Amino acid sequence: FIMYSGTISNGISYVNQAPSCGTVLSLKFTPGNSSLIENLHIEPYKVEVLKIEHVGDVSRATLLSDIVSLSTAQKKLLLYGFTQPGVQGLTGDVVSVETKRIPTPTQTNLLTIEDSIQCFTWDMN
């Protein structure tokens, strides 16, 4: 099980496969002034992902975040990096990620995000 930290580029996956059940993954994203994914501007954010599941025809991540809602840019930057093909459509000022396992969630906003892609999936329980 491999986690990636550093400069994000197209084809990067933050993990190489789904972690085992119960894993909480912290990812902190630091863009520049003009970082774009699929023409959408990326602002900084921190997430603690409790699980990603497939529901119907979408991937659904349940996470705790330092911010009240994620933009489409932040959703795609996160979820594309949880797929085998990895991040796509990223350009502009470099974005860095730090990815780590943490023992317990710390952030205070519970968010559910989805996209019609094939993320790596793992359960919380």
Author numbering: 78 to 202
What does the paper behind this entry write?
In group B rotavirus, which causes significant diarrheal outbreaks in adults, the VP8* domain (VP8*B) surprisingly lacks sequence similarity with VP8* of group A or group C rotavirus. Here, by using the recently developed AlphaFold2 for ab initio structure prediction and validating the predicted model by determining a 1.3-Å crystal structure, we show that VP8*B exhibits a novel fold distinct from the galectin fold. This fold with a β-sheet clasping an α-helix represents a new fold for glycan recognition based on glycan array screening, which shows that VP8*B recognizes glycans containing N-acetyllactosamine moiety. Despite the novel fold, based on our glycan screening study, it is likely that VP8*B, similar to the VP8* of RVA and RVC, retains the same functionality of mediating the initial cell attachment by recognizing specific glycans in the gut.
As a representative VP8*B, the amino acid sequence of a human RVB, isolated from a gastroenteritis outbreak in India32, was expressed and purified for structure determination by X-ray crystallography. We used the well-ordered region of VP8*B (residues 83–192) in the AlphaFold2-predicted fold as a search model for MR, and determined the crystal structure of native VP8*B at 1.3-Å resolution. The crystallographic asymmetric unit contains two VP8*B molecules in addition to a short peptide. Although we purified and crystallized the recombinant VP8*B containing residues 65–233 of VP4, only the residues F78-N202 are observed in the crystal structure. The electron density of the N- and C-terminal residues are not observed due to their flexibility or a proteolytic cleavage that may have occurred during crystallization. The small peptide with four residues could be the protease cleavage product co-crystallized with the globular portion of the VP8*B. The electron density of the side chains does not match any residues of the N or C terminus of VP8*B, possibly due to heterogeneity of the short peptide and the lack of sequence specificity of the peptide-binding. The VP8*B structure contains seven β-strands and one α-helix. Five of these β-strands form a twisted antiparallel β-sheet that surrounds a central α-helix. Structural comparison of the two shows a high degree of similarity between the models with a Cα RMSD of 0.398 Å and 0.403 Å with the two VP8*B molecules in the asymmetric unit, respectively. Interestingly, the side chain of Q195 also interacts with His131 that is present in different conformations in the predicted and experimental models, suggesting that subtle changes in solution may affect glycan-binding during virus infection.
